[PDB]
Design an enzyme around this catalytic site. Sequence first.
Site, mmCIF file in Angstrom:
data_model
loop_
_atom_site.group_PDB
_atom_site.id
_atom_site.type_symbol
_atom_site.label_atom_id
_atom_site.label_comp_id
_atom_site.label_asym_id
_atom_site.label_seq_id
_atom_site.Cartn_x
_atom_site.Cartn_y
_atom_site.Cartn_z
ATOM 1 N N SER A 1 40.781 66.000 -11.178
ATOM 2 C CA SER A 1 40.402 64.616 -11.464
ATOM 3 C C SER A 1 40.113 63.729 -10.247
ATOM 4 O O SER A 1 40.972 63.525 -9.396
ATOM 5 C CB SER A 1 41.484 63.957 -12.322
ATOM 6 O OG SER A 1 41.292 62.556 -12.378
HETATM 7 N N1 LIG Z 1 39.207 54.231 -14.401
HETATM 8 C C1 LIG Z 1 40.233 55.244 -14.536
HETATM 9 C C2 LIG Z 1 39.580 56.512 -15.063
HETATM 10 C C3 LIG Z 1 40.576 57.663 -15.271
HETATM 11 C C4 LIG Z 1 40.041 58.725 -16.214
HETATM 12 O O1 LIG Z 1 38.931 58.636 -16.734
HETATM 13 N N2 LIG Z 1 40.880 59.737 -16.413
HETATM 14 C C5 LIG Z 1 40.549 60.851 -17.298
HETATM 15 C C6 LIG Z 1 40.617 62.221 -16.652
HETATM 16 S S1 LIG Z 1 39.454 62.548 -15.314
HETATM 17 O O2 LIG Z 1 38.113 62.443 -15.805
HETATM 18 O O3 LIG Z 1 39.620 61.609 -14.242
HETATM 19 O O4 LIG Z 1 39.716 63.878 -14.853
HETATM 20 C C7 LIG Z 1 41.562 60.896 -18.393
HETATM 21 O O5 LIG Z 1 42.746 60.631 -18.152
HETATM 22 N N3 LIG Z 1 41.064 61.249 -19.582
HETATM 23 C C8 LIG Z 1 41.849 61.381 -20.791
HETATM 24 C C9 LIG Z 1 41.902 60.131 -21.621
HETATM 25 O O6 LIG Z 1 41.328 59.107 -21.212
HETATM 26 O O7 LIG Z 1 42.471 60.240 -22.703
HETATM 27 C C10 LIG Z 1 40.809 55.407 -13.130
HETATM 28 O O8 LIG Z 1 40.164 55.020 -12.148
HETATM 29 O O9 LIG Z 1 41.911 55.917 -13.023
#
Ligand SMILES: N[C@@H](CCC(=O)N[C@@H](CS(=O)(=O)O)C(=O)NCC(=O)O)C(=O)O
Lengths: 214, 214
Positions: A10
């Site tokens: 991530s």
């Molecule tokens: N804007 C957030 C985005 C975080 C995000 O999109 N996390 C995803 C995973 S990843 O794409 O970053 O790997 C997540 O937790 N997704 C699961 C959910 O939202 O349920 C940040 O900056 O932390």
Amino acid sequence: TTVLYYLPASPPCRSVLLLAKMIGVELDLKVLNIMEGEQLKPDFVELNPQHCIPTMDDHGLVLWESRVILSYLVSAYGKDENLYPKDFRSRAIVDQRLHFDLGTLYQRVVDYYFPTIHLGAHLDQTKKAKLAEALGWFEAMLKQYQWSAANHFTIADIALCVTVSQIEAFQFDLHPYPRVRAWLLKCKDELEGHGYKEINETGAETLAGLFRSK
Amino acid sequence: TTVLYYLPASPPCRSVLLLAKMIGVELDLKVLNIMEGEQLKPDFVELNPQHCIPTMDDHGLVLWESRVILSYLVSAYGKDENLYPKDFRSRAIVDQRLHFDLGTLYQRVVDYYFPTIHLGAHLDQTKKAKLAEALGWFEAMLKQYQWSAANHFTIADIALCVTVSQIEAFQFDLHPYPRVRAWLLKCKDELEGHGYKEINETGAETLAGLFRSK
Ligand SMILES: N[C@@H](CCC(=O)N[C@@H](CS(=O)(=O)O)C(=O)NCC(=O)O)C(=O)O
Ligand SMILES: N[C@@H](CCC(=O)N[C@@H](CS(=O)(=O)O)C(=O)NCC(=O)O)C(=O)O
Ligand SMILES: [Cu+2]
Ligand SMILES: [Cu+2]
Ligand SMILES: [Cu+2]
Ligand SMILES: [Cu+2]
Ligand SMILES: [Cu+2]
Ligand SMILES: [Cu+2]
């Protein structure tokens, strides 16, 4: 030690890891396999309504949004470094760049990549141009300072270093943007002794492999 | 006086106007008719690469991104009010909520509305559910405090007050979210004597009229 629910690959989680490693914040890691849907379990959703990662629990203080965790950790445990300028006139620029990344650069990376990475969608030519358009804005933004929002290294460079380092991994042609490429080198040499390879280089690949794979 | 290139109807511009009116920051206004493409002219694009509004020029200090301007103006001219808590533990929550708004709540408002507002596109059922899903997260987020990120009024409420006040104008059914509706009332009574009607109520309508029109 601060708890962090994360996933190595991530991009948002890697911003937090780099900073933490850079300023010596020990992390008690808890991998959350979002692919298997672990973030959807009751107790995490009770922890974080939006059930996403990274999610920090710093001695009861729960907080999420990678870029908010950057400013926070830096305000809570920073030192001799100045990854988050106290002068508001300066902090503004760093904030601006972190918002740029969240609401523009990165958002557009997710739009042109993750779909095909999540459902094997086909790449969208128009959606690839918007990403190029944003890189263009960033290119113009790299003119004023030696770094992205200050004439010294700050948390914006970390956030943005992770977004562009990913773009690069996706083998996006960054030839049109020499300032971006120039700053990107500085960011790598800057983080190299702070787990860049171990944290971000290994993470961008697996994430790129999952994009190229399918 | 601080210069602000804006457009009355614009949600991001209205956040800035409300705050500014609330903390007494005199604004030298410069309307930028984005519809006629005035933001694309050389001298503005030279000012702001991403050529967007709101854009502030506070005595040479150029800066854009409504939410970054909120924190800034508040750090530069705030007073007895505490619309942006100094304690980092507290500021984090307010930041988190402002990022929530930029990268989630508002983003999803723009996705389900502006297209039809910009090109007469048809509403997307799935895109409307995501907005509902986010309102749901916000609903859960309104549990802890009396306000959105503190037990007192902060700049997050302003940002979010503008996003939800717009949703409401678009006549989105907010019946499922009583905490949101409850907090929304507080925000209006809180801003009423600070140009809410004059600034945000008149702006949400014209923007809603342009959505309902076509
Ligand atoms: N804007 C957030 C985005 C975080 C995000 O999109 N996390 C995803 C995973 S990843 O794409 O970053 O790997 C997540 O937790 N997704 C699961 C959910 O939202 O349920 C940040 O900056 O932390
Ligand atoms: N994240 C920005 C978004 C600002 C934005 O999207 N501005 C639009 C106008 S409006 O939708 O808010 O009315 C703009 O300037 N668009 C023209 C351009 O981007 O070239 C903020 O919070 O300020
Ligand atoms: Cu500890
Ligand atoms: Cu140059
Ligand atoms: Cu290393
Ligand atoms: Cu002045
Ligand atoms: Cu309750
Ligand atoms: Cu009024």
